[PDB]
């Protein structure tokens with residue numbers, strides 16, 4: 001015969017990058033299902049930790065060990081911050097609030113405020129959900145952002161390039177630095193910047209600083225060689241990359 | 247005065263000795279204590295209270311055989327209509343909304359995982375939940391929901407897990423019977439007269455709405471309330487995600 005679209009996409013979903021796997025569709029599907037169920041049975045028997053959660057924790061350990069303060073800010077923020085971010089893809093909620101499309105606005109308020117109680121340099125970071133009406137191969141609507149930044153005198157690209165390297169070296173991911181765009185192949189892993197920037201004026205930040213934002217789903221995409229980033233995202237359709245529609 | 251009192255309670259900490267000293271002098275002493283606390287934290291801690299508790303709770307459950315779940319926060323509006331709600335919902339756009347609870351997604355995982363895992367199916371999620379709201383309620387809170395599905399799951403197992411859980415977190419509690427129409431004979435996990443969690447033993451009518459036929463037990467705890475008890479916070483806003491507090495310390499210094 002020849003697989004119909006519906007059957008190819010179906011095999012696609014049940015397929016795993018590590019799969020060793022002609023044969024008719026029903027046999028291919030039956031065998032792949034059997035494997036996926038076993039893969040799930042293994043995770044349940046040995047691991048049990050969710051990829052998204054586990055990586056978040058590992059990333060948190062790294063930064064917390066390197067002197068960064070772990071921030072947990074609101075996901076539902078005032079629409080003002082979006083304006084204040086010089087934004088003239090957003091999920092609006094109610095009257096003047098929305099779902100944070102980035103971690104920057106809330107981190108800015110922490111840099112400013114903390115800058116009055118903590119000695120330079122101020123090192124903070126946050127890992128969490130961000131939303132953007134979106135190319136499900138690199139982009140999701142609900143993704144997880146890692147944002148870190150250090151504020152104080154002397155902060156430079158060098159400093160920045162240092163953390164990014166120790167970081168990705170730690171995670172165990174290849175990369176290529178090329179504002180900076182931490183690339184892995186041609187997949188953008190992160191967007192980093194060396195302060196100060198005009199926008200700093202909009203939030204009361206008057207010291208130089210360095211920061212980078214990474215998408216944990218892309219880190220996972222690369223770490224587990226997923227074709228579709230959705231396999232790394234929050235969903236009820238995949239668990240640690242294993243289809244749940246079995 | 248009134249306004250002075252308010253900004254004083256904001257800088258006042260639970261562990262402080264807290265009468266007649268002039269305001270300026272009182273505010274000053276608190277501002278320095280707060281920066282000191284915030285400085286000790288930045289030097290020896292650095293872990294968000296919410297994040298740390300989540301990580302501790304996660305280890306507790308993964309170690310007892312529960313699978314860790316991370317599901318969408320932005321869920322389909324129908325899941326709400328499906329839970330039996332026709333409320334304080336943050337609708338976003340056409341037909342989506344910020345989950346007001348974890349039940350729907352966990353219901354789906356139970357249904358799907360039952361086709362691949364041997365009973366008992368044990369899962370749990372920890373994450374953001376939303377409800378439009380004061381001294382005990384946040385609009386944006388953090389929920390922990392765990393449940394086991396499979397025959398055998400009795401009220402006994404439920405009370406036993408909660409007990410090991412709260413014993414591990416070192417949180418004194420009382421479990422009182424509660425009864426309502428939709429959920430039936432429920433379990434209230436109390437600390438004084440503050441509710442820590444609602445615990446239910448399935449099956450219940452609502453189940454058929456999600457493709458679940460088997461019995462189960464589950465309970466949901468709000469982390470902020472767990473924090474509020476552990477740290478003896480007066481206002482639950484001390485533990486919530488916010489730009490005004492950090493581990494219960496005012497950031498306006």
Ligand SMILES: Nc1ncnc2c1ncn2[C@@H]1O[C@H](COP(=O)(O)O)[C@@H](O)[C@H]1O
Nearest residue numbers: 138139140143188189190191214215218
């Ligand atoms: N829509 C998205 N879906 C998934 N990840 C994203 C998305 N947008 C951004 N990211 C991740 O966050 C990084 C920085 O995004 P940004 O600086 O806002 O352009 C990107 O390089 C990705 O690592």
Ligand SMILES: Nc1ncnc2c1ncn2[C@@H]1O[C@H](COP(=O)(O)O)[C@@H](O)[C@H]1O
Nearest residue numbers: 382383384387441442443444466467468
């Ligand atoms: N608005 C809220 N703010 C903080 N915690 C909450 C809130 N709603 C529920 N919780 C916590 O979650 C538990 C169960 O909530 P429910 O979904 O109504 O059964 C409550 O007893 C609290 O422990």
